[PDB]
Design a protein around this ligand. Structure first.
Ligand SMILES: Nc1ncnc2c1ncn2[C@@H]1O[C@H](COP(=O)(O)OP(=O)(O)OP(=O)(O)O)[C@@H](O)[C@H]1O
Lengths: 171, 576, 542
């Protein structure tokens, strides 16, 4: 648990971009990568778009779950979500930060998305405290993940359990 | 309009505050106030220019309405985030706002008809303020005629099970001493405070203020309230009870503490313009720090602080030194002519015997006076008492509320004929010894001649007294700097540590005081003609003070050889 | 031109930046960023003086290949200065142009950035080392006894005749006057612009580089009313967004026609109309009358007096928007004409909108000649760690420090003037000073001192007989036990006719010569003993 440790997890996820070159001094690295030729999309992980966009080589575009409309209806789904809601790729709180950091030289609508993603973030986080104001009787066989994410749950992990076990031992 | 504001602008304003680094909001601040019951929030007044260029210039003119459109926007933006789901808004709650700025301070002498119903900024000083009665918002002003067989002409019964309740305190303000009171005396003003800012200002402090000058009823009346108070930085203008000091400040502080060249650094701190007089000065600074107020299972609330003495021929800079000790946490100063009585007056309203109460005003501060000499004895007995038990009693009319106050005290003096008395015998004081006994320090001043000292005190003063010299070269000295630090540093150091002695100090101190009293008695017997618990119980306070200095709880008697060699000055002074 | 040489630059290097300047940091931080782009590690350098340079090379006495120095060159025949230089790649890019040609030739270990409309020294070497008298080039350099492939020895006569008749132009070089020339890193901007670098902050940095010595009174711009085309042509023509610019961070930078009065933005007015020279001296405020004429102008503008002691930022709206909308037109008729100039501005975000030159007057105030003995180099490392968008707690401290200095400046000027310390002392004017300040220890502030007294006295107490005469000044350093600093400075309003004093002080050095130093690559400066100037001044009259 760190701000970057889970980027050695999460940053491996995939996006799809367009570079500006022909094939490089080497053409392709033996692996799942596809061939490099300007003017067309190519699918990549995310430990390069950092390296690439600021290397002034190419453009970049996001996945589809980054919008306004889908992330304006998912919240009203979440409002009645007595348990959980829709989960676009399940570590989407970090791709947004590493995209909206550099990318906004060309990306559209680079603030209102921040507005809505925090507006979902806070509501689900405050949800993930009220589990605790009902969690009774040492019920360590009954709890919630059903459409939970990861980037929230490290914000609880060292507080509650590390003491909860040796405390609520009595029941 | 009422709604186009709340409809989008204020409601999205808080939502829109954005700098990456993902801090730059008032949302998280609002929630982390909410969680802990605070119910407030702060803003500047030149951030809205970072949002628009009009609303601010409307905030000045119609503030009283805008500062409720804020409250509505605040709660309707905050209760969405109260919701974990629809099941933990137990019930909503109301808040108060604060705004601040750094524009410019004003003076009371310009508060006139044009500066009315309008925002301002001033800087003054405080005397006292009221208690905490009440005021509320609604319940189930003119209450008109209709009723709601007949029910006549205004039968309205308040249902105060169904009424509400907020706070009310009525603060006060006097001016500063450098804005033409010269051909006058200083005027002052009374104030108003609303919900969460009682017990935010004790009297006797320097203020910044953000307020508004509005009326209540053509000769009609004035008043002012807080529109988001803040405070002063006259070095540390307001650093007297609370803490916005940070780990950085604690770090710098305690990193100064272990620095074992701080005390001899601080014996040269008070006077960037005066020469010499260092052994006089090694315990004008410890007087601030104070020792320990150790109560016990029996009665003995033994004397906490210490007390100072000095008398000497003029021409050695007494006055400037005491004015400086006033300057550098909280204190006051008079000298002579003032009391023996306390204040049982009567508000002509209601005709009762209230207690206005000013050794009260140093209950954590201190006090300094000159001329215990030239103020006669009708007002010395109440102060005979106060400074040994601190239980300032009252027994005048049908009240026996023996309140108390913990204050120390500093004494200058003037003896007749210079060192005429100080050479010969019993004309040290002309009055009595039990306020010469009941003190700690015993430091006499002389102005003896020597040509080297003469010529040096000549040129030393000239470079001081030439053209406001000290812009560049004062702080470039080693560590003799920044009284502001001293204020905040004391208000730390006094309010943390609970020190007390070791084993090895006790026997050495007992033997030393034994030899002192034995020498006094031998001077009695070696002259065929003529030592309190107070002396021990005071000199212990210098060990207390020193351990307070270095932040070590336990201190040694080898650490305190300095203190007892300071008391040596007293001993060989009252040598006769 | 290094669209061809830059492809040599991959291997190891050393990036030196000679003595402190705003050209320095501006032209060098950009290159730091460049060289951390193509994956090379490199070295940035402080210079406190040419001895620091020689010990630096001593400290870097290796065979490092692509060694660089920028904004220097006129010190030695640098081949002679530099023994281990055998085939090593040197680079100059300096704007102090009037350099000897011994440094230019020997095309192995230098880079001739010779490019100008002045073909003035073409045969300048064809007689110095090529000919000689009293020494087989087949010239005077070789034998002179009628052996070189009216008398047998008129060889030397014609040789020295040509030599001296063109020392008429050699004495014109390095022995009449000095200056600087062109920019510090605008050439470097256009260099990098081929490599697709649209760093708006780099444009701001080079704007800082120019607006230092765009001070058409201090050092000439020349390109200025041509760069109102040129720099805009760099930036304005290439627009990445025609419709999407209502953004928070680093909105694409702009240009507007504004003024050079000090710190109009961050302070109140009536103290900030008081500390510049051009507004003050042309209104004469250190006398009482100037406040009255100022006041009667404030009438015509009809600003409130109370407002004129509030911060401009702190004013209400309509005045603080209409301010310059008024001042530009009804100031032309009341003695002051030429504070309006061409500069830029931009905000990072919401805090406030910094003024495109208001860093340099904090930078100049970051020269803290403190007694800690370290702080010049730390001041450098702070300065280049300041110009970013990131570090900004310190720029406000810089502004505060700057303003309190600038309002300490006047405090000495009234003190000095109306006691009539303006000693004529013959052909030029002369000033003397007694003890030390942390304010005006170093000489940048010292030239700033001189350039308020000068206009004040020489404009206002004389006829037009002596309004064109030069300047000197003492400045003691109780720092170094007594050295009695001096600086040379020019007469009034002659932009191109710059310093005689590139060497001119050396006349008295030639006559008698006493412990003189020229440790700075700066020519317009000298350093002395504590009081060994008086007879040296009697020498240094003519
Ligand atoms: N030791 C000293 N060094 C430098 N300045 C001094 C010294 N003593 C006195 N002064 C100057 O004299 C003034 C101090 O005189 P001060 O007011 O203390 O006399 P005083 O103690 O009030 O006399 P008295 O006790 O008779 O009233 C200061 O303003 C200071 O400038």
């Amino acid at each position: 648990m760190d701000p970057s440790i889970i980027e050695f997890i999460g940053e491996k996820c995939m996006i799809s971009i367009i570079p500006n070159f022909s094939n490089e001094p080497l053409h392709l690295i033996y692996g799942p990568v596809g061939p490099f030729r300007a003017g067309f999309p190519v699918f990549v992980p995310l430990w390069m778009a950092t390296h690439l966009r600021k290397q002034q080589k190419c453009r970049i575009v996001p996945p589809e779950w980054m919008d306004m409309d889908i992330l304006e209806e998912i919240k009203e789904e979440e409002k009645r979500s007595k348990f959980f809601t829709k989960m676009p790729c399940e570590h989407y709180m970090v791709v947004a930060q590493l995209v909206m950091s550099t990318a906004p030289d060309d990306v559209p609508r680079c603030e209102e998305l921040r507005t809505v993603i925090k507006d979902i973030f806070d509501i689900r986080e405050s949800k993930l405290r009220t589990s605790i104001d009902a969690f009774i009787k040492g019920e360590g066989t009954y709890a919630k993940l059903d459409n939970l994410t990861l980037l929230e749950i490290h914000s609880v992990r060292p507080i509650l359990p590390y003491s909860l076990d040796h405390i609520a031992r009595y029941q | 309009i009422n709604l186009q504001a709340v409809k989008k602008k204020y409601k999205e304003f808080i939502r829109t505050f954005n700098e990456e680094n993902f801090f730059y909001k008032y949302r998280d601040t609002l929630k982390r106030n909410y969680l802990n019951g605070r119910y407030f929030l702060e803003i500047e007044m030149e951030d809205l220019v970072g949002f628009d260029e009009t609303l601010a210039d409307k905030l000045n003119k119609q503030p009283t309405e805008h500062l409720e459109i804020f409250e509505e926007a605040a709660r309707e933006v905050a209760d969405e985030i109260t919701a974990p789901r629809p099941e933990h808004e137990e019930h909503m709650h109301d808040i108060q706002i604060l705004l601040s700025s750094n524009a410019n301070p004003t003076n009371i002498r310009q508060l006139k008809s044009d500066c009315v119903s309008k925002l301002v900024k001033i800087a003054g000083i405080i005397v006292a303020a009221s208690g905490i009665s009440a005021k509320a918002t609604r319940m189930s002003y003119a209450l008109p005629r209709k009723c709601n067989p007949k029910c006549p002409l205004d039968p309205f019964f308040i249902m105060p099970d169904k009424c509400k309740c907020v706070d009310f305190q009525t603060l006060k303000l006097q001016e500063l001493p450098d804005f033409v009171p010269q051909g006058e005396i200083p005027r002052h003003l009374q104030l108003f405070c609303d919900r969460s800012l009682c017990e935010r200002v004790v009297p006797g402090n320097r203020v910044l203020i953000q307020g508004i000058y509005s009326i209540r009823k053509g000769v009609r009346a004035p008043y002012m309230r807080v529109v988001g108070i803040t405070v002063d930085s006259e070095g540390a203008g307001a650093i007297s009870r609370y803490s916005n000091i940070t780990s950085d400040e604690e770090e710098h502080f305690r990193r100064m503490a272990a620095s074992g060249d701080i005390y001899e650094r601080l014996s040269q701190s008070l006077a960037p313009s005066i020469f010499g007089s260092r052994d006089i000065k090694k315990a004008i600074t410890c007087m601030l720090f104070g020792g320990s107020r150790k109560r016990l299972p029996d009665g003995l609330c033994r004397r906490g602080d210490i007390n100072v003495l000095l008398l000497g021929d003029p021409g050695t800079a007494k006055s400037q030194l005491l004015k400086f000790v006033e300057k550098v946490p909280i204190a006051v100063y008079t000298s002579g002519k003032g009391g023996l009585t306390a204040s049982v007056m009567k508000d002509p309203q209601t005709r009762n015997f209230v207690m206005e109460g000013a050794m009260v005003l140093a209950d954590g501060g201190v006090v300094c006076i000159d001329e215990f000499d030239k103020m006669r004895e009708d007002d010395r007995v109440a102060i005979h008492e106060a400074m040994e038990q601190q239980t300032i009693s009252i027994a005048k009319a049908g009240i026996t509320t023996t309140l108390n106050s913990r204050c120390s005290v500093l004494a200058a003096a003037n003896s007749i004929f210079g060192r005429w008395d100080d050479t010969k015998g019993e004309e040290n004081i002309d009055f009595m010894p039990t306020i010469l006994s009941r003190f700690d320090m015993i430091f006499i001043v002389k102005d003896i001649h020597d040509e080297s000292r003469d010529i040096t005190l000549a040129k030393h003063i000239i470079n001081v007294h030439l053209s406001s010299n000290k812009s560049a070269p004062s702080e470039p000295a080693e560590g003799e700097i920044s009284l502001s630090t001293f204020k905040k540093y004391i208000h730390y150091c006094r309010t943390h540590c609970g020190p007390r002695l070791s084993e090895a100090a006790g026997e050495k101190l007992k033997s030393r005081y034994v030899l002192m009293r034995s020498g006094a008695g031998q001077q009695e017997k070696a002259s065929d003609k003529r030592i309190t618990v107070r002396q021990l119980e005071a000199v212990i306070r210098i060990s207390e003070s020193l351990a307070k200095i270095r932040l070590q709880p336990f201190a040694t008697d080898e650490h305190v050889n300095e203190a007892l060699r300071l008391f040596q000055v007293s001993t060989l002074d009252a040598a006769m | 031109l290094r669209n061809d040489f830059y492809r040599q630059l991959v291997g190891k290097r050393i990036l030196i930046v000679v003595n402190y300047d705003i050209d320095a940091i501006c032209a060098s931080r950009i290159l730091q960023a460049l060289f951390k782009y193509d994956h090379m590690l490199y070295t940035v350098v402080p210079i406190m003086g040419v001895t620091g340079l020689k010990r630096a090379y001593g400290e870097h006495q290796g065979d490092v290949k692509y060694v660089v120095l920028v904004n220097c060159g006129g010190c030695v025949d640098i081949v002679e200065l530099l023994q281990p230089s055998d085939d090593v790649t040197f680079f100059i890019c300096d704007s102090h142009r009037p350099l000897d040609v011994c440094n230019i030739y020997s095309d192995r270990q230098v880079c001739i950035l010779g490019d100008a409309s002045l073909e003035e020294n073409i045969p300048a070497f064809e007689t110095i080392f090529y000919d000689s008298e009293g020494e087989d080039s087949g010239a005077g350099e070789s034998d002179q006894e009628d052996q070189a492939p009216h008398e047998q020895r008129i060889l030397k006569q014609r040789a020295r005749r040509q030599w001296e008749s063109e020392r008429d132009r050699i004495m014109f070089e390095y022995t009449q006057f000095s200056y600087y020339g062109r920019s510090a890193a605008l050439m470097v901007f256009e260099l990098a612009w081929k490599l697709s670098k649209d760093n708006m902050d780099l444009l701001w940095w080079a704007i800082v580089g120019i607006t230092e010595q765009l001070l058409l009174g201090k050092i000439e711009s020349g390109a200025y009313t041509l760069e109102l085309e040129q720099i805009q042509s760099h930036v304005s023509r290439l627009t990445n967004k025609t419709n999407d610019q209502n953004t928070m961070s680093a909105s694409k930078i702009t240009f507007e026609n504004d003024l050079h009065l000090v710190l109009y933005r961050h302070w109140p007015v009536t103290e900030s109309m008081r500390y510049s020279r051009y507004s003050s001296c042309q209104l004469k405020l250190w006398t009482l009358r100037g406040e009255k004429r100022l006041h009667e102008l404030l009438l015509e503008m009809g600003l409130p007096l109370v407002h004129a002691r509030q911060t401009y930022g702190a004013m209400d709206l309509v005045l603080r928007k209409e301010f310059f909308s008024m001042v530009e037109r009804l100031a032309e008729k009341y003695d002051i004409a030429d504070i309006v100039y061409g500069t830029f501005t931009l905000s990072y975000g919401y805090r406030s909108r910094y003024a495109a030159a208001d860093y340099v007057y904090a930078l100049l105030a970051i020269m803290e000649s403190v007694k800690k003995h370290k702080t010049p180099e730390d001041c450098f490392l702070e300065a280049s760690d300041a110009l970013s968008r990131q570090h900004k707690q310190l720029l406000s401290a810089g502004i505060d420090q700057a303003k309190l200095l600038h309002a300490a400046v006047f405090r000495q000027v009234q003190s000095s003037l109306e006691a009539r310390q303006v000693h004529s002392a013959g052909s030029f004017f002369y000033y003397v000073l007694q003890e030390e300040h942390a304010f005006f220890s170093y000489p940048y502030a010292l030239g700033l001192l001189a350039r308020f007294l000068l206009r004040g006295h020489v404009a206002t107490s004389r006829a037009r007989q002596a309004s064109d005469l030069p300047l000197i000044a003492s400045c003691p350093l109780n720092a170094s036990e007594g050295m009695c600093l001096l600086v040379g400075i020019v007469p009034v309003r002659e932009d191109s006719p710059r310093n005689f004093f590139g060497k001119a002080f050396e006349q008295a050095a030639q006559k008698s010569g006493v412990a003189l130093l020229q440790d700075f690559f700066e020519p317009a400066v000298v350093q002395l003993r504590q009081s060994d100037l008086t007879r040296f001044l009697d020498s240094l009259t003519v």
